[PDB]
Amino acid sequence: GMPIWSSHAPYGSFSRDGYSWNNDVWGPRPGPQTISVSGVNRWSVWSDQPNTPGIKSYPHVAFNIGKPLSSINTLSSSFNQEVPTGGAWDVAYDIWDSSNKHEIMLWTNYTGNSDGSGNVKPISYHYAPSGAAIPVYSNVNVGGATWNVFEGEGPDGHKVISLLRTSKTNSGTVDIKSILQWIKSKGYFGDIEVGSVQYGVEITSSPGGKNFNFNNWSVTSK
Ligand SMILES: OC[C@H]1O[C@@H](O)[C@H](O)[C@@H](O)[C@@H]1O
C-alpha cells in the first residue's frame, strides 16, 4: 500500500533484511519501468516494453544462500502473484550458484507454452522446425509440481537449465532443494554451492504498460 522503496531508474536497487530488489532494464531503447516495494515479502513492478525481439528487463527480488547443496536441510520458496493477460513475458525463479556457471530457472506463469513454443521460449541449444525449443525431459514431477526441462547456454558459456510448469499457476510453493538434487542426479553439476535465489519477470513485450504484483514472496533456508 505505501512503499518502503520505489525506483524508476534502470538497475536501481534496495535491500532490507537479506532481501534485495533490482530494477534491471537494459538494451537499445528500454521502456519505462517502475518497481515499488511495500515490505520484505510484498512488491510490484509496472513496465511498458515495446513489441520487439529479445528480453528487455528482469525486475526481481533476490535472496542469498551461500551454502553447498549437501549442507542444506531445507530450501523452499512461496509465491503469490497477480499477472496481466497479454504481452510477451515469463514469471520465473532464477537460481544461481556462487560461481555463476549454472543458472536454474523455474517458470511459474508465462505467455508461451510448456512444450517450448510461443512468443517466449526457454534458452535452448536445439529447436524444432516450427521454432519451438526442444525439451530434454518431459513431464518431470519434482519439487511439488510437474515440469518440462530445457537445456541451453548463455552468452558467456554458462549452463542454463529451465523448468516450465506444465500447469501454469499464480500461487504455490517450490522445493528448490529437491529440484537441485534431481538436476544433480542427471549429472548437470556436482555438490553445487547455492548462491542466489531470485524471483521476478523477464519482460520481452508489454506495450501500453503491464502490471505485475507479487503479493507474497518468501524463502526458507535451513
Ligand atoms: O532465448 C531467450 C532467453 O534469453 C535469456 O537471457 C533468458 O534468461 C531466457 O529466460 C530467455 O528465454
Numbering used by the authors: 15 to 236
Please give me the paper's original passages concerning this structure.
The N-terminal end of NopAA contains Type III secretion signals and the C-terminal domain of NopAA has been classified in glycoside hydrolase family 12 (GH12) of the CAZY database. Obtained results showed that NopAA has a xyloglucanase activity that may play a role in cell wall disruption facilitating effector translocation. NopAA as all T3Es possesses a secretion region at its N-terminus.
We obtained unique crystals of the truncated effector NopAAΔ48 from Sinorhizobium fredii USDA257 in complex with cellobiose, diffracting to 2.2 Å resolution. In NopAA, these conserved residues are Glu117 (nucleophile) and Glu216 (acid/base residue). The cellobiose binds to subsites +1 and +2 making few interactions with the enzyme, which is consistent with the fact that cellobiose is the leaving group of the reaction and probably has low affinity for the enzyme. In molecules A and D, the glucose moiety bound in the +1 subsite interacts through its O3 and O4 hydroxyl groups with OE1 and OE2 of Glu216 (the acid/base catalytic residue). In molecule B which is not in complex with cellobiose, the residues 141–146 of the long β9/β10 loop are not defined in the electron density map whereas in molecules D and A, this region is stabilized by the interaction with cellobiose. The β9/β10 loop, close to positive subsites is very dynamic in the free enzyme and probably prevents crystallization of NopAAΔ48 in the absence of cellobiose. NopAA possesses a specific insertion loop between β9 and β10 longer (25 residues, from 125 to 154) than the equivalent loops in the other xyloglucanases (10 amino-acid residues in XEG, and 4 residues in BlXG12).
